[PDB]
Every structure is written in C-alpha cells, then in structure tokens.
Write a protein that binds this ligand. Structure first.
Ligand SMILES: Nc1ncnc2c1ncn2[C@@H]1O[C@H](COP(=O)(O)OP(=O)(O)OC[C@H]2O[C@H](O)[C@H](O)[C@@H]2O)[C@@H](O)[C@H]1O
Ligand SMILES: Nc1ncnc2c1ncn2[C@@H]1O[C@H](COP(=O)(O)OP(=O)(O)OC[C@H]2O[C@H](O)[C@H](O)[C@@H]2O)[C@@H](O)[C@H]1O
Ligand SMILES: [Mg+2]
Ligand SMILES: [Mg+2]
Lengths: 195, 195
C-alpha cells in the first residue's frame, strides 16, 4: 500500500548521492525520508557481493576466511567477509569466486547464493548477494594462495576457526581497536545459537 | 598505519550527511573518500540496536521474531530484526528491550549484547549493537502481544521457525518480492551451516 512518490536530489558526489524521498504511507498521507544511493549502481542484480568462504581440510576444523582493512567512513580498521561490486553480465556466483580469488588467492566452489539483500535499509538502497563458497584446503590449487590486489587496495587476510568464531572475533577485538562487520557478527552469533 | 587527515562536510540534512574524507594510505599518499554519517549519533554510542528476539515455548521449537515495513531508501518492504536508534543516555540493552516491546508488544529478557558492529563500512560510519533477547511465549503476559508504534510507524510482525529460518525467508522473498536484511540473512545462513 506504500510506494515512492518522488526522489529529490539533494547532493551528488562521484560515488554517492543524498536525496529527499517522498512516499505514501498506509493512511494515504505523504511523508519524506533522507535516502542514500551509490551513483555507480546499474539496473543489474545488486551493488555487489559478500563471500562467506569456508576453508575445508580433512582432519581439521573448518576456517572462515575474513579480510581486515582501513575503512575511511569508519576512521578505523574493520573485519569483514571478502566483498566487492559486480561486473556487467556477470553472475553473482561468478563475482564471488573472482572477488575471493583476488583478495585472498583462494579458488573456491559455490555452495549457495542468496537473493539480493539490503545493507542498511533505513539509510540506503544498497544491496548485495551473500555467496557461500567452500574452499578445498587440501587441493594443491590452494596450497599457498596469492592475492591479486589493485592500486589503493591494502587488505589483510585473517582466517578464524568456524567452530569458535564468535570468541575468536572477540579475542581479535580485545587486542586493538577494531570493528567487526554486523554480517560477520550475525553469522558468528548464529553458529552459537544454532547448537 | 592509515589514518584520517580531515573530514569536510559536503551536505547535511536533518538525519543524514555526506562528507569528504581525506586519509593517508600505507605508502604515505593522500587519498579521499565520500562518506555517509547520520546526524543523530550521540557521542560515545552506536547509532542503534538490532534485536534478535528468540521466542521460547514449551511445546514448540524456538521462533525468531522479525518485522516487515516499507523502507523509503529501498523503495519497498524489508524483513529485518526489530531495530531502533539509541536515545541519548539510553543503554543498548534498554533501547533493545524498549524497541522490541514497542514494535511487537513482547516483553523480553536480555541474553547478550554485542560490541558495536558496522552496517556498511565502505559507505558509512553507522554501527549498532546486536542484542539477543529471549521471550517467554508461554507466559500469559505474552499470550496476545500488542505493539504501540510511535509517530507514523507501520510495522508488521513475522515470526519464523529458527530451525528452518533460511528456507522460510526465501519463500517470503519469492512470494512477495520484498527484501531480507543482510544481517537477518547472514544469521539464517549460519543456522543452516551449523545444522
Ligand atoms: N564512497 C566512496 N568514496 C570514494 N571511493 C569509493 C566509494 N565507493 C566506492 N569507491 C571506489 O570503488 C572501489 C570499490 O572497491 P570494492 O572492493 O569493489 O568495493 P568495497 O569498497 O569493498 O565495497 C563492497 C561492499 O563493502 C562495503 O560495505 C560497501 O559499502 C559495499 O557494500 C573502492 O575501493 C574505491 O576506489
Ligand atoms: N534517514 C532518515 N530519513 C527520514 N527520517 C529518518 C531517517 N532516519 C531516521 N529517521 C526518523 O527517525 C525514526 C527512527 O525510527 P527507529 O525505529 O528508531 O529506527 P530505524 O529507522 O528502524 O533504524 C534503525 C536501524 O535499522 C535500519 O537498518 C536503519 O538503517 C538503522 O540502522 C524514523 O522512523 C524516522 O522518523
Ligand atoms: Mg573489497
Ligand atoms: Mg525500527
């Protein structure tokens, strides 16, 4: 019953724009909202993908591969699932394997993919596909993985035991000022709440 | 290694603002970034809280209480954990219990509270505390929950089986084309991966 009436551009940069949204509520009344949008968004599937990479090795606990990097908006370092924007004509799964191999050097296999999900719905229209990727750590292909980083990209690879993820994330946070991503934390929490 | 050099306000609304961030990368080179920030953030406190409401009943497996509402930035409806911005001086735990009761009518008990985690670090400095709350669904008091939304709030309550959360979320996305929150989905995936 609710829908968008109009979007008034407020300010637009090279990557992000801010606009005043006018919409109709359930009572037929008009209301406004301040919304954010990436200017690099196409009429594709989503702004990007986030990869949940599960490193598997026989006789070993599984490991979750994460990345640490400085995030200007946060003014500090953050612990996140590897992620990146998608390419035209590229499938979410294709981008996931590509982003994973580029940031971590690992070559994985698609386990499953999510529909487009929202990053922060009360603020922006940003969406991503969360792609679960398993990595055969016993394959020579993944013996010594080498990441292909671009210019201006300084990412650190951190692998943590999946069987104790939440506590291991807490331990990392106890060593220095670090912010764990909400999707990573939600994931770690569910692993404990499940069983 | 890396650090903020300055933050220049580009545009500012009543709720959201856009800034130009200048920072130094590892090589010593000055780079820039377009960052988003909420104008309502109190000092020394995350922007808000997301509540993971665990409905517990003697004759049933646990349920996760979620809410569905129209999100202007998304131009459509979203399925999320109950959430709200934190009032000044209000504890994350109190904001969570209050928000859950207001949006769903359930009175819960604190189980745990996470440190501040980021929503979308590549875009904004927004953070929240993920607060796990248990609800005694057999208490007469929770027999027929009645919410009490504030100014212009139209939120719908949707409780789903924790044991089959992922599948149940996919159905809703296909049946009504709406969008699931990335944290809700990340949580659902781990529940599945653990089981
Ligand atoms: N707001 C911005 N300001 C300046 N440059 C930007 C911005 N957004 C994107 N860019 C440029 O595009 C590049 C995209 O790099 P990716 O690795 O593909 O994307 P990433 O920054 O990791 O974002 C992927 C996801 O994570 C974050 O939560 C982000 O909001 C997105 O949802 C950035 O490194 C940068 O050069
Ligand atoms: N960007 C905005 N534009 C217009 N009004 C806003 C905005 N942000 C907040 N408000 C006003 O403040 C109110 C805050 O309501 P809450 O329930 O306390 O917060 P909510 O909007 O649910 O946000 C909490 C969290 O959940 C979402 O992921 C959102 O992005 C945020 O991180 C909104 O209903 C609205 O009136
Ligand atoms: Mg990246
Ligand atoms: Mg809310």
């Amino acid at each position: 019953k609710q829908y968008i009436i109009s979007e008034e551009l407020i300010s637009e940069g090279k990557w992000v724009k801010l606009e005043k949204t006018t919409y109709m509520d359930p009572t037929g009344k008009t209301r406004t909202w301040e919304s954010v949008k990436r200017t690099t968004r196409k009429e594709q599937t989503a702004d990007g993908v986030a990869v949940i990479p599960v490193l598997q090795r026989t006789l070993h606990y599984e490991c979750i591969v994460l990345v640490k990097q400085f995030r200007p908006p946060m003014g500090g370092y953050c612990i996140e699932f590897p992620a990146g924007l998608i390419d035209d004509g590229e499938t979410p799964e294709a981008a996931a394997l590509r982003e994973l191999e580029e940031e971590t050097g690992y070559k994985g296999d698609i386990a499953e993919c999510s529909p487009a999900v929202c990053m922060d719905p009360g603020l922006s229209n940003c969406t991503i596909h969360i792609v679960t990727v398993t990595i055969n750590g016993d394959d020579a292909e993944n013996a010594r993985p080498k990441p292909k980083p671009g210019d201006g990209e300084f990412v650190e690879v951190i692998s943590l035991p999946k069987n104790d993820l939440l506590q291991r994330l807490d331990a990392l946070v106890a060593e220095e000022h670090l912010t764990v991503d909400a999707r990573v934390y939600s994931y770690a929490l569910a692993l404990k709440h499940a069983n």
